């Protein structure tokens, strides 16, 4: 059970962008430092980097007191955008080995760490302890390969994906800088996980699929309801211009569709007119709005449009998505293939063009039929096992390489 932060659950901006142009899609999950137009750090010259130690201790203390003040047990702390800052709480880094994994979290979403352990035969004294995560004793593997007896494997686990992770040490040279309009802050950060290839648990839709089109529609609908809720006017009213600015690729006519059932156009002598909430229309509750569209569904959709943009950039037209190698790497194909195989509907290529590492240390998620048929499945498991073990060994290794001069 995953409980996201309130800003994420509410699909607030900027945590959940309403629109992304080509540039943003290319930079998806890699935001570049952009200059500020105003505020302290818009100014030239040196700026102080501030310590956070007193602040970190204080917030931990305040949070624990709030915990004891009601009057123990479990509390949920991620209620406001302010609670999501890197400025307090314990922090880890996670570095993703896939250049563009099929699903990624937005800021404000939650994930668990699970410590998968397989018992040694006979008298097992229990799993080793880890600094992070909750131990899970598993007789069957949640991955493509099987755990060996006595093997502990850490992993990220959420509704988008499961992925093995490997704990490493941050280099002694490195610090985390947090940057706001107001100043820089610095934190020590020692724990950094390498993330291995994802096992997708959520299916990414194809471009212009019914699923994709239903999603943008519903997301637009949610944004609209939230606009009415934000309005302080009685009767509530919103401006077309504000919707168009958030959804610049929607025609005014398609936006009028979403508005015709809940609102009335009020014309004024000025090129700004209002849509006023109908007096017999009951605005959906917070709880009902949340049920309309989940953060996971937004993540699936984002994955599609970003991939679609990268494909266009590489010369692959919409008619391409009998199929080109590059199109096989698309998240709508890889997630579909992996999930089908998880349900026993087919097997996976494993060795193939969709291996995200390009060098045999990752899996190619491409459907092959279940179609000597005990040898067919034993060969699939053997190959899965080999790559599974290879990935764990390479990504957990502390060996120092050796810059490639090419």
């Amino acid at each position: 059970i995953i409980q996201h932060s309130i800003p994420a659950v509410e699909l607030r901006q900027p945590f959940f962008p309403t629109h992304m142009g080509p540039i943003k899609l290319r930079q998806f999950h890699r935001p570049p430092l952009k200059k500020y137009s105003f505020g302290a750090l818009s100014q030239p010259g040196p700026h102080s980097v501030q310590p956070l130690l007193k602040h970190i201790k204080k917030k931990a203390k305040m949070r624990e007191q709030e915990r004891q003040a009601s009057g123990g047990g479990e509390m949920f702390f991620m209620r406001t955008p302010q609670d999501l800052t890197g400025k307090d709480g314990d922090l880890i880094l996670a570095e993703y080995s896939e250049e563009n994994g099929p699903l990624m979290m937005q800021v404000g979403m939650a994930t668990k760490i699970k410590n998968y352990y397989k018992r040694k035969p006979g008298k097992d004294p229990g799993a080793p302890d880890c600094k992070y995560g909750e131990t899970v004793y598993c007789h069957t593997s949640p991955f493509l390969g099987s755990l060996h007896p006595g093997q502990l494997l850490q992993a990220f686990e959420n509704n988008l994906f499961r992925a093995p992770i490997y704990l490493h040490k941050m280099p002694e040279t490195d610090f985390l800088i947090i940057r706001t309009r107001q100043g820089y802050y610095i934190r020590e950060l020692v724990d950094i996980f390498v993330v291995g290839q994802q096992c997708p648990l959520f299916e990414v839709p194809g471009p212009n699929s019914k699923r994709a089109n239903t999603h943008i529609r519903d997301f637009l609908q949610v944004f609209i309801y939230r606009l009415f809720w934000k309005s302080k006017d009685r009767p509530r009213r919103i401006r077309m211009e504000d919707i168009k600015k958030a959804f610049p690729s929607h025609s005014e006519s398609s936006i009028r569709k979403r508005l015709k059932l809940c609102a009335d156009f009020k014309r004024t002598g000025m090129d700004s007119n209002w849509w006023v909430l109908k007096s017999d229309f009951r605005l959906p509750t917070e709880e009902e709005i949340r049920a309309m569209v989940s953060p996971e569904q937004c993540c699936a959709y984002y994955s599609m449009i970003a991939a679609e943009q990268r494909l266009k950039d590489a010369g692959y037209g919409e008619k391409s998505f009998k199929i080109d190698d590059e199109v096989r790497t698309a998240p709508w194909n890889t997630t579909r293939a992996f999930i089908a195989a998880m349900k026993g509907k087919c097997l996976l290529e494993v060795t193939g063009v969709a291996d995200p590492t390009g060098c045999g240390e990752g899996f190619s998620y491409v459907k092959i039929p279940n179609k000597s048929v005990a040898e067919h499945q034993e060969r699939y498991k053997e190959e899965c096992q080999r790559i599974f073990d290879l990935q764990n060994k390479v990504l957990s290794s502390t060996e120092v390489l050796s810059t490639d001069t090419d």
Partner: protein, 123 residues
């Protein structure tokens, strides 16, 4: 607005000085460590106890997330990190592709771009 986060990398001698300061938590860290970014958005100067280090903002190959936690079991994403400010002991403080970093932060992602990233096929 989303919080911006990035990695600061210092030469080891300077990193040691700064780490002790972070750990002591003293307020004067704000004077002892400053960052200046030049108008080009790529070069800058980091100052440790007034000593200027030539610095360059580089683009990391792997997406990196910072995640915060209270109980060490459930984690919340606070940011995407994709850039590093690299300070060196030599170099032009005011300099008149070279900003693409080839390695991940962690050991196994050495040479990630060249060795461990499937490359895109055009057309």
């Amino acid at each position: 607005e989303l919080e911006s986060q990035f990695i600061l990398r210092l030469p080891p001698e300077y990193a040691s000085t700064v780490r002790r300061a972070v750990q002591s938590g003293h307020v004067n860290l704000k004077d002892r460590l400053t960052i200046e970014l030049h108008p080009d958005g790529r070069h800058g100067i980091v100052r440790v106890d007034r000593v200027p280090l030539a610095s360059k903002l580089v683009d990391l190959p792997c997406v990196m997330e910072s995640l915060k936690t209270i109980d060490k079991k459930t984690f919340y994403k606070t940011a995407d990190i994709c850039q590093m400010l690299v300070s060196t002991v030599d170099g032009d403080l005011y300099p008149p592709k070279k900003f693409i970093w080839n390695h991940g932060i962690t050991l196994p992602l050495k040479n990630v771009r060249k060795r461990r990233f499937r490359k895109t096929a055009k057309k």
